[PDB]
């Protein structure tokens with residue numbers, strides 16, 4: 097029940113791969129939100145119509161204050177518009193750019209907020225699979241909001257950025273909700289250090305490094321954090337913790353809230 101006519105388009109917020117995300121306000125209501133404009137010429141030529149259908153079917157059903165809301169979708173001849181929660185303070189990516197590292201209180205908080213989002217996701221049997229700072233957003237009160245469910249699915253799978261991908265995904269093997277735990281470790285490490293634990297200059301070095309769980313900690317990383325990151329980045333996914341173990345990790349609990 098929506099058309100472009102119902103919106104005034106403000107500034108472009110982010111320049112994505114298949115289109116951009118614009119600030120915008122609904123007209124009858126004066127409601128501020130984000131409008132993500134994908135258009136089909138590129139989507140079909142990339143053959144990802146069903147990836148987008150899952151992104152929608154999933155992100156609509158989910159409601160959680162640490163997950164970006166998708167109020168709905170619509171389309172015309174050329175474009176498909178996603179009507180999205182507007183998150184004022186931008187991405188964690190941009191925040192990490194400004195501040196080469198986060199401290200342990202900011203980092204641990206973001207993780208508790210992220211864990212909640214995930215334990216809710218994994219409760220609905222949904223996996224995100226593309227957690228990274230680019231796909232985390234920040235509400236008006238600084239709160240963390242996961243977005244961009246482009247690579248989400250239900251239950252197990254195979255298929256198959258790459259810094260945040262686990263061995264089971266890149267190597268080709270099948271995988272589950274455990275990927276989001278590996279990614280959470282990558283992400284925790286990056287927050288504290290300022291770069292992902294397996295970063296390389298070429299794809300092929302990164303594959304090998306990820307495959308062999310080849311990462312070292314700086315001197316300045318505390319053992320509490322070292323512990324949680326080491327537990328999350330285990331090659332054998334089964335070994336990686338439950339989300340609640342992470343939420344009730346002493347280092348986390350010390351530094352969260």
Ligand SMILES: O=c1[nH]c2cc(O)ccc2n1-c1nc2ccccc2[nH]1
Pocket residue numbers: 109110117130132180181182183184185186187233243244
């Ligand atoms: O509010 C936002 N919703 C978004 C959805 C997306 O898929 C990607 C970016 C979104 N976004 C947003 N808010 C911003 C605020 C400042 C700078 C960039 C932003 N992107």
